[PDB]
Symmetry: C3
Amino acid sequence: EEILEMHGLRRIIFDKMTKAKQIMPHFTVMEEVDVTSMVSILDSAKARNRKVTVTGFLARIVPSILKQYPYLNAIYDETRRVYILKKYYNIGIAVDTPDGLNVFVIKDADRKSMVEISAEISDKASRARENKLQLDEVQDSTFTITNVGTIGGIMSTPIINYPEVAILGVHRILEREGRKYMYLSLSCDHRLIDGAVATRFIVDLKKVIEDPNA
Amino acid sequence: EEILEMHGLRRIIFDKMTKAKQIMPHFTVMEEVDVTSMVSILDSAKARNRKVTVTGFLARIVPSILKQYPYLNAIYDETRRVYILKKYYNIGIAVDTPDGLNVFVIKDADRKSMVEISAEISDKASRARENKLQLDEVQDSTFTITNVGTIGGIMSTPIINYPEVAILGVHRILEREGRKYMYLSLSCDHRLIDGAVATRFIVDLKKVIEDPNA
Amino acid sequence: EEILEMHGLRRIIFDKMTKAKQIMPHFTVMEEVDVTSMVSILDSAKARNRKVTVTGFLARIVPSILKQYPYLNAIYDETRRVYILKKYYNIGIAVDTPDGLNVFVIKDADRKSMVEISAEISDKASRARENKLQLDEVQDSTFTITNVGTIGGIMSTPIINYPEVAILGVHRILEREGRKYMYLSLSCDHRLIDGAVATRFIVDLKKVIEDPNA
């Protein structure tokens, strides 16, 4: 066998993790979403004004509900028993780059329209692959979203990006009967966030992918 | 952006949850259940009787299945080595108060009718929203159950209330095809609760909800 | 109320699990699989070929796909600094004993046929539930599987057999359309197995169960 060691980016992502759930107890909850009301909304706009990705539409909605539920847009400090509830919203996006999993951020997401946020993730991801991305662009994720759906998968239990307080898992689309379905999940620090309040969050969010007309 | 320090109640959970998935490695399972037979025994004793809730119900069945699966109801102590299994089954239950989440214990659930159990849940739940609960009433839980199935959600990897040795996760009543199913989840310390002996229990339970004609 | 502490097997697993989800942080993804082609492939081969098990079938394909993601067939280490990816494929498949859970290795599995495999898995099994098993047959698992779908449960968050770096949960099969599906959960270490690769693995498994023919 060939023993192989640890890298830079690999040593980072190793470390982020060994710590993330060294000190954040993970709770994870899910619902499903009648995404048919969603799915077509991109297809009509993928018709005129490419693009809006699935990643891209979600990041559009997610902030305005973290607005109602503040406990989820927050950070975990080393002053120990402490807080940082961030009022501004820069959301993280986990992408696969040939070296290892890289998180980056959408500058004030609660400001950007559908297309912009989607043109940006396009801008940064292929730039994230060619490993030419900059110090400021990977920093200050108040919250973060992980899509596996462009590969596959029903539902996962993702590990929260430290030191945020919450992460959200996008997955593959379904087709139950005869509507378009998809499972979403939520993982969080089960101390700064209850059971109930994590779930109360996903339903208010679900309701705006349920009703994009709201 | 805002700050602050860890609160009385919130801090008790903070510590409890860190010392939860800090000592106890988590294993969770999910089994689907047909609650159709259940739903209408809810709707029939909703009218000619009253109460007997989605929660208040399960609390009635669980203590007897724990009579068969002894490993599931014991609390984990100070000393490593030791386990202590308990022969007296009172279940704790997960109510969200305004002051943070709570766990009260309807005692010896094996000697109270679905009605008492579902009065006692609401009796105590109503007072839990004023933390006007007695220190006595929130004690000694051998097992615990948690209902987001009021607020929403189809699936969970929940956190065992420490020092108990497992937990059960109640969810939303999805209607697939023409009958009613809700997913259940059970997490537990996989040090004494094996791969099988977890599934074996939630598989034995799956029966009891799937025919309350028992 | 009964003390009862720790025995032989109980100690080996307790200790093995305490330390498992104590170093290795646990990310896990689920995929649903159309096993109708598999299931009918069993029954045509059961009416005449004595074998093959749900396990053993899965087990045959497993090493094939580890030969495509080098990372999942690996085992963690002493001094932190190291990782050792394994090149031969020995799949440890875990069944029940009377004392608790056991794991044993169906060794160099990429060579053996589905009939070959399933005869071995059922052999070592009835042995291990008699605790009549060699130090030999419990050697170098490069990768672990856990079928509780013989008991029930659509899914679980199975914890990786230490220090192997991936695991796979096998589950209860349910009829939908009604076609035939079950869920496939793969847990693993999130230090190496980035999100995308876990999924990229269990879409790459999901695709083989669905097309056993090309």
